[PDB]
Amino acid sequence: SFVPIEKLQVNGITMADVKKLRESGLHTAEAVAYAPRKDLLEIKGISEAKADKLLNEAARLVPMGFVTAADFHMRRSELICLTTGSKNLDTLLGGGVETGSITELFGEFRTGKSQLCHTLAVTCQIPLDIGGGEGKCLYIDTEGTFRPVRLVSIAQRFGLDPDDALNNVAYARAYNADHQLRLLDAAAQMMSESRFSLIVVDSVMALYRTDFSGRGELSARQMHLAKFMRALQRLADQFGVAVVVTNQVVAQVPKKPIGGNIMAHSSTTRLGFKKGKGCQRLCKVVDSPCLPEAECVFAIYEDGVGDPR
Amino acid sequence: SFVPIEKLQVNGITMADVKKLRESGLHTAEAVAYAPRKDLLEIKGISEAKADKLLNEAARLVPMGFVTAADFHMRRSELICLTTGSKNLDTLLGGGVETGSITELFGEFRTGKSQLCHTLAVTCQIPLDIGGGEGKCLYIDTEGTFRPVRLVSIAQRFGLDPDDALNNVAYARAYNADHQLRLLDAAAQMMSESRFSLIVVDSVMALYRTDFSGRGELSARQMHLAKFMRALQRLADQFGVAVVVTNQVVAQVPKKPIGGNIMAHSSTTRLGFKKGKGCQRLCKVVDSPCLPEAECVFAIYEDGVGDPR
Amino acid sequence: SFVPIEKLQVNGITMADVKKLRESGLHTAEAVAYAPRKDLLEIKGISEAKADKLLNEAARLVPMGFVTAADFHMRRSELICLTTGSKNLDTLLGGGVETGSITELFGEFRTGKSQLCHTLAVTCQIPLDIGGGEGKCLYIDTEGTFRPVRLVSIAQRFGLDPDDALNNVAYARAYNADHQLRLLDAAAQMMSESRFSLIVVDSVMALYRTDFSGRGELSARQMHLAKFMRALQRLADQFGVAVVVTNQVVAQVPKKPIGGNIMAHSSTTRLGFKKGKGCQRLCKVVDSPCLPEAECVFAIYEDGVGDPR
Amino acid sequence: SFVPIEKLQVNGITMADVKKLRESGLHTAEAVAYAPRKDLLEIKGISEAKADKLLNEAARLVPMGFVTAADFHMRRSELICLTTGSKNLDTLLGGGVETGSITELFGEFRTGKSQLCHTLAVTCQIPLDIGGGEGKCLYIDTEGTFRPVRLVSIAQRFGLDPDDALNNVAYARAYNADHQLRLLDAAAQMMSESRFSLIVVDSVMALYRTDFSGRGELSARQMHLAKFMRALQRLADQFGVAVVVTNQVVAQVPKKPIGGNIMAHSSTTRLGFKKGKGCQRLCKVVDSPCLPEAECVFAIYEDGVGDPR
Amino acid sequence: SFVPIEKLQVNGITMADVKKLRESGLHTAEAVAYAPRKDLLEIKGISEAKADKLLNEAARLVPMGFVTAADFHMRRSELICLTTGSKNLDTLLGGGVETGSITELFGEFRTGKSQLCHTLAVTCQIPLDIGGGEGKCLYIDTEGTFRPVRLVSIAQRFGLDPDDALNNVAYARAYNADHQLRLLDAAAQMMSESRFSLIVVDSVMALYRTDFSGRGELSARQMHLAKFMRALQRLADQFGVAVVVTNQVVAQVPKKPIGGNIMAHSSTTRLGFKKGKGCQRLCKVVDSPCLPEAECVFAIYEDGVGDPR
Amino acid sequence: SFVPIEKLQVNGITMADVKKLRESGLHTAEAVAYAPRKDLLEIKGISEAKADKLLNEAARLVPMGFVTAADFHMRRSELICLTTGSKNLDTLLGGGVETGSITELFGEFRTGKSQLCHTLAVTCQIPLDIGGGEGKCLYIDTEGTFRPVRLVSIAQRFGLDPDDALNNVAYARAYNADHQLRLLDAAAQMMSESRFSLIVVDSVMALYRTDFSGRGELSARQMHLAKFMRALQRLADQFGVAVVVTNQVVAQVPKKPIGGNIMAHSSTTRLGFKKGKGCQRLCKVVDSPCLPEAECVFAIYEDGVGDPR
DNA sequence: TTTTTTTTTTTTTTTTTTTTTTTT
Ligand SMILES: Nc1ncnc2c1ncn2[C@@H]1O[C@H](COP(=O)(O)OP(=O)(O)O)[C@@H](O)[C@H]1O
Ligand SMILES: Nc1ncnc2c1ncn2[C@@H]1O[C@H](COP(=O)(O)OP(=O)(O)O)[C@@H](O)[C@H]1O
Ligand SMILES: Nc1ncnc2c1ncn2[C@@H]1O[C@H](COP(=O)(O)OP(=O)(O)O)[C@@H](O)[C@H]1O
Ligand SMILES: Nc1ncnc2c1ncn2[C@@H]1O[C@H](COP(=O)(O)OP(=O)(O)O)[C@@H](O)[C@H]1O
Ligand SMILES: Nc1ncnc2c1ncn2[C@@H]1O[C@H](COP(=O)(O)OP(=O)(O)O)[C@@H](O)[C@H]1O
Ligand SMILES: Nc1ncnc2c1ncn2[C@@H]1O[C@H](COP(=O)(O)OP(=O)(O)O)[C@@H](O)[C@H]1O
Ligand SMILES: [Mg+2]
Ligand SMILES: [Mg+2]
Ligand SMILES: [Mg+2]
Ligand SMILES: [Mg+2]
Ligand SMILES: [Mg+2]
Ligand SMILES: [Mg+2]
């Protein structure tokens, strides 16, 4: 899947160097190849003529150049898509949630944004025959709305055993906007010792709202948010996983998502949710590079997301 | 239950720094662990080294990482819930009011919100075998509708001595929004010395209506409200108590609650009350993370909330 | 009772400060302790660095904090209730009109609201041992229906002195909404020197019906009204006076009061009137914080309000 | 259309010198004629008395003097334009995007910058008689939004062979700003072996935002960008290709492009995009040395960009 | 209107000395008169005892002595001035752009600098009775924005055959800073054979930005720029022509031109441009020897610079 | 006012020797007495037995030795001072511009130094009882910003005739440093035939910057400048006139004058000019042996330098 | 032993309110 970080111990590079890189946050050779010279120079003990050797060796083990469009097409026709549990939603997105990008979901209260995440936390483990990825799940929660009792029911629906289903999921809660960025290094270190398929952030902007209050703090807030989004995208490129994030709305003094232009330009796919009749809900594609604009209906039942009955 | 704050006095940290932190508002190690470095820096007399040492010690004391979902399920199985006094209501709520989150009640005039809060303030003290919480209650009133004469009868119903029931409630009245926000620090200071189990805030939005007037003052109003809500949630995290708040309605020019999206997105459970025939009221679940939509019927009597006769 | 506003002159405060305060409208320490700082920073001369000085003062004069509910019971067990002239009404009200809160009376034309106001304006002077308030009365008229011969006849019924009686009632007439609101400052000034015991507003929504017209101004109307209502409560908080307000009805399209949700939520007690046979009338309790629903009968005579014969 | 660098060895210059130059990053005689002397005296192995000879020889093969405006008028009269697929835009721009200069596109999210880049990557491969280039495309992606399925659809629209269309586009992904600058050397190497007609940078400012953060790094940012822009111009001088670059927007704390005065003075043409009704968009000319302000409308379909019905 | 250099060869000076002097870069007697001795003793083949002869010989042909201010006043009255195409501007300038001086035009992007330079390039050939100059223009472009079609549009406005108006302009493009300085020698050689009456340099600081980079090259950059300005002033003195340059701006971290004190002190007149409403622009007087501050308004049309409707 | 040279023709000294002295640049007995024996040798015609006799002569007619303080005080009390024209300026300088010294004005562009020079040039011709000298003007120009029209306009405000105001001014233009120093011999010779009260050099360092460019040529530029300043001082002492000189500024990598330490020590009075609001300017004394350091405000108007209205 | 020079560069959204009025 990836190139380990111990393949760089050659031409004078020792074990202390690799240990220092590990302590900094780099855990594979891809991370080394993706960083610029100044970032390495900021690492204690890494002087010049070590940085040039590290970069040249990493670029030797990893390619960064030109390839035809046909090669990229061939490599893209093998990416895995996750299944949502509903056929209308699968048809709308062309198969499901894809790996290697970022999907964003926004709407008002009780429109079903976290039930879908709960369903994907179980659908990412089943065999690839029925639309899974045979992996684990990482969950980051900033609101306090995570419940395993729904996972047990969804597992029962999909044919898995409860103990294994709950044993293949890792959970963490965030308390401010620095802890949120700190958890990503731990995630990257955990992902290189086993196999993962999905990452969830629920939600992104909830803690940024109160930590930077009013005009006079807007610039710092937007810079911090941009850093977080770049780190998430780098994780997705490193490990080949799927990333899902949630967002809130505000009124135009008829409603729009929060986060400014950084958020709008950073996401790859954007979906909007609306309330319907009874237990039904409506979904619409707002932004995407390869799908047209359309809408569909889904429903919430005791065992997860499904089609209208 | 929580880690005292005097355990952060190692590696040459003087009691003057601890006293300054307490005067700022923090009274547990968890509280220091939950705050970003900017907040500590704003305090006079705290430098970079002091802040770094404080953060490291707190993080070592309190766990902040990744666990498994089975472990979290096993922990959540031990959370207790409080009985409301009505069997249909308890069945509708999955057992009663749950600790660790926030519940909001809304309706029009004379629909039963204040009486339910009174009955909860009495029931949160009875032995845990029958459904109590064995603690004290903290009541914050902003309209002037608190009446101990009701608590006397409700306590008589469950078999308590009126003086014990009356002495174990701490009451406070507010006169504008700033006093409202200020009282929370005194609440937190009081909490860390005794065993509390419930906080009540009656009409969080009554004072905000007239302190800010018309368009041109909306943003400041919403920002102040957001800070208030975040402080409430942090208290719930720190001490593992239950929090109840009430709200008012307005007409659509058929009735909806006031407060906007800031209030809609930050509550965990939402209940709507309606007037019925005689002394009977109707209750509906409008929002929840693990319950479906359902309705029930309860009644108001001289001794509190109960089942229809 | 109310502490004078001249006690805010201990450190760094002169007589000019109190002068501009009394020009603004404040007439007691409580009036300054219950006010927000933004309001303080709006009087020419008080710019900044002095509002905090006043706020810190009066904080040790006016008590503000958390107390036990048993002490609140002890405090509230010493309030004053003024008789209504009818025994059935006194029994239905649990003692009589209560000071510190707001009581509303509504009904259709010639049902007996204004006669009750006239009776109260005299009963609020007799000694406490017979149900009287032994103070003065303030009366505000908005329809041109104040008739002083009724006062003489009623006062004779209760064994008073007509010359003594007629000089103990303050009478005002208003011509528009702004004039109505402005009379409240003179009311506070008059209450600042001589004791009073009751405020009567008859009626409260008469001029609002005309000064604001069409759907294009409702938003402003309900805002203006809101401020008025808040101001009334503040007086009851300072000097401990009983407020009595009157209101009209409209047809549903069988009758309901006017004012909307602002009025419905802002009142503490609500009573409804209907016409009986001959001079008799029927009264009903439509809302209350501590009383059940019940009905009663009274009657109108040459000398006020009494029991049916 | 360019003089090969191998002609630089005539008398006194050996193949080793040309090899050293090629390793430096010069691939044509023009690249030597346009370079200052202190740039030439910076490649190890090159000594004085040889840079002078190189410049003297290059000046002989590449003309650098004075001419009359009639000659310039004729030469610019014989120049090529690339069709955008929309007749409205072609009429607005006077033919279309022209080879030799820099055209910039700016707007907010989902306004259609990337769809026009995808359309141009196909129209740059069709014959000259129908507004084509008869070249190849270079695509540099800093966002990760390149999708070859759109290429196949558009190619079928314009009557190409999808296999060949996929073999005639070169694609690269950049991970930081130094990598972005370094890819231009490989671009220069590639264009000197086979004919190209179009370069796309999508987008130009995305990685600069996070690589340099804050006030203290603004100058070094704007200097780096300057170099990049200058390099782009040189390519258009050397091989005669069209350049298209993409840009984002920000809010005036009503929206403006990012990049500053360097960006504003370095671009020869600027276009602004806005969101219309359905699948329709509005285009406005914001800068040009020969064209007036105006506006038009276009649409996004399954096969690319086109005219609205 | 100048003394040809062939007059300097009288007795003891041969033709080869004149040929060497011309190869050095001097083409007029005034040129030798204004040059110091030290740089005369820098051309190979020029030995002492001849520089003294040249300095003595030329002083008798070019009057360099003390004169009365009345004679100078008379001389400064038969001075040419060229119309800018707008009546508002000519009044603010006192007649046009004066020959023998240096005028600078600065402003942000698309403010009309290059358009005014394109209009001036035509009026410098129309007869004297209407503000013309009856000569030729020398145009130096360092950005790529010179368009011979605007000249075609503007020429017919003033009544010219566009072929003549096109053949009477000399155009040259520069690529680095040293080329820019090298072109001035050819310009000076051209001016000594036919009648020219203007010189445009657009822009003057574009290539200096990137040829020197950082704080470590500022001194050399600023010393290189001084020689350019001195040579321009020498050409203005020698042949009596107007000299017009253009400049860019930066942000003060509201905008200022670039170039420093060297540029600020060397120009005779300075004018700033700004963007108006529609096709309307504003012009200001920022520095002059004998003019007061004042502002006007002009407009850009398809036929050049004019008054606002 | 001084001893004519022709008075030194005595036993042994003939007309030819005095003619040789006149040709060498000595046009006064003081000039002969001001030079050291060494200097009176480069002339062609005197070797020895003549220089000693000349030194013995030219010293009995000119005192060179000790005096008292009171005698010098009495002789210096009869020193005429020119008037600036602005009362604030006249007060600031203790009476106006003095004679027998050197004044240096420096500042950034368009700060008003040249206008002040023009005003002094016309004011030196007014009758003495209002602050004049009753003499002519000597103007030496290096930048090329001399305008007679300002003199024509400034002659009116003082009652002088225009034609006679412009008939008493000699003008010269300098083209390099050699010529700049050469002009002084002619200046002194002409002044030895009339009455003069003003010499102006404007500006003094413009031509030195590019004549001695770059390190390695330093330390010769400074010698040339020192010789020029010494010659100026000798002129001023010989004829008892006033001298004015202007200067430029550079930035410190907030601005300082150019020239070095030779300039700083050689000048007698130094003044710094700053830009103000509208047409106001600020002045500050920087160096003076018998003056305090203060700041003053003046203004520029169509008639000259005046008080701020 | 001597003898100072010379400016540069933009960034970045927020946040709802408030009922009226009888007819044969
Ligand atoms: N056990 C359950 N059975 C059926 N429906 C449920 C169950 N639990 C929650 N729901 C539904 O899911 C909704 C909650 O949506 P959620 O996705 O949590 O909102 P948000 O969009 O704010 O994240 C509730 O309105 C409820 O109707
Ligand atoms: N002792 C009592 N017995 C029966 N009903 C009561 C008693 N006290 C109050 N009530 C009823 O409770 C209602 C008031 O409910 P409350 O909680 O005050 O409404 P809200 O808080 O929503 O304004 C009234 O309609 C009243 O009839
Ligand atoms: N002096 C009186 N003697 C007997 N009955 C009276 C007298 N004055 C008024 N009433 C009766 O009492 C009623 C009082 O109406 P009022 O209270 O003014 O109506 P509202 O409450 O709408 O203002 C009248 O309808 C009238 O029938
Ligand atoms: N196959 C398709 N058919 C129709 N519309 C599409 C298709 N693919 C993408 N779109 C639409 O094109 C829009 C433009 O996206 P894009 O031009 O990539 O945005 P940007 O201008 O930010 O680069 C998207 O909002 C999407 O709805
Ligand atoms: N033919 C034309 N008709 C009208 N306006 C034009 C024409 N050509 C260019 N312009 C306008 O001239 C303006 C300034 O262009 P230019 O003078 O080249 O700017 P600058 O001088 O700042 O480089 C542009 O805003 C453009 O819209
Ligand atoms: N006739 C006039 N009326 C008013 N102000 C003038 C006139 N002529 C020139 N000025 C002002 O004088 C200033 C030029 O000052 P100048 O002597 O050139 O300064 P410096 O020589 O220090 O550069 C300009 O700002 C200009 O506005
Ligand atoms: Mg939600
Ligand atoms: Mg209520
Ligand atoms: Mg009435
Ligand atoms: Mg985009
Ligand atoms: Mg421009
Ligand atoms: Mg100047």
mmCIF file of N, CA, C and O and ligand atoms in Angstrom, chain A residues 108-111 113 143, chain B residues 264-265 267 287, ligand 7:
data_model
loop_
_atom_site.group_PDB
_atom_site.id
_atom_site.type_symbol
_atom_site.label_atom_id
_atom_site.label_comp_id
_atom_site.label_asym_id
_atom_site.label_seq_id
_atom_site.Cartn_x
_atom_site.Cartn_y
_atom_site.Cartn_z
ATOM 1 N N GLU A 108 -29.663 21.808 8.335
ATOM 2 C CA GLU A 108 -30.142 22.280 9.628
ATOM 3 C C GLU A 108 -30.288 21.099 10.590
ATOM 4 O O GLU A 108 -29.845 19.985 10.309
ATOM 5 N N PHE A 109 -30.910 21.329 11.740
ATOM 6 C CA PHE A 109 -30.921 20.326 12.796
ATOM 7 C C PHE A 109 -31.853 19.163 12.458
ATOM 8 O O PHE A 109 -32.892 19.340 11.822
ATOM 9 N N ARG A 110 -31.447 17.961 12.876
ATOM 10 C CA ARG A 110 -32.222 16.723 12.760
ATOM 11 C C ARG A 110 -32.444 16.280 11.311
ATOM 12 O O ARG A 110 -33.396 15.561 11.019
ATOM 13 N N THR A 111 -31.558 16.650 10.391
ATOM 14 C CA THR A 111 -31.709 16.262 8.994
ATOM 15 C C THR A 111 -30.960 14.975 8.638
ATOM 16 O O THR A 111 -30.928 14.601 7.462
ATOM 17 N N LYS A 113 -27.526 13.854 9.453
ATOM 18 C CA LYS A 113 -26.124 13.888 9.051
ATOM 19 C C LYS A 113 -25.269 12.866 9.795
ATOM 20 O O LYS A 113 -24.319 12.338 9.218
ATOM 21 N N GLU A 143 -18.852 17.053 19.224
ATOM 22 C CA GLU A 143 -20.148 17.465 19.747
ATOM 23 C C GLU A 143 -20.659 16.603 20.889
ATOM 24 O O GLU A 143 -21.331 17.124 21.778
ATOM 25 N N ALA B 264 -30.749 25.913 18.024
ATOM 26 C CA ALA B 264 -31.177 24.643 17.445
ATOM 27 C C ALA B 264 -30.047 23.615 17.423
ATOM 28 O O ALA B 264 -30.279 22.430 17.681
ATOM 29 N N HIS B 265 -28.820 24.044 17.117
ATOM 30 C CA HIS B 265 -27.727 23.104 16.884
ATOM 31 C C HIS B 265 -27.019 22.632 18.150
ATOM 32 O O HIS B 265 -26.276 21.651 18.083
ATOM 33 N N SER B 267 -28.407 21.886 21.351
ATOM 34 C CA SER B 267 -29.153 21.065 22.293
ATOM 35 C C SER B 267 -29.078 19.602 21.881
ATOM 36 O O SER B 267 -29.073 19.282 20.690
ATOM 37 N N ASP B 287 -36.295 16.055 18.697
ATOM 38 C CA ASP B 287 -34.904 15.828 18.336
ATOM 39 C C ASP B 287 -34.268 14.909 19.370
ATOM 40 O O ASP B 287 -34.549 15.031 20.561
HETATM 41 MG MG MG H 7 -27.644 18.380 14.669
#
